[PDB]
């Protein structure tokens, strides 16, 4: 997995896991 970084990652590394959505959508 390479993240790719600020755009929506909430299930791994662009925030730990909690892009505004403990795991599921902003």
Known sequence: ???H???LVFF???VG???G???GLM
Request: glycine content about 0%; charged content about 35%; aromatic content about 6%.
């Open 21 to 23: 959505a403990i795991i």
């Open 1 to 3: 997995y390479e993240v």
């Open 17 to 19: 896991s909690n892009k």
């Open 12 to 14: 791994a590394e662009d």
């Open 5 to 7: 970084h600020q755009k």
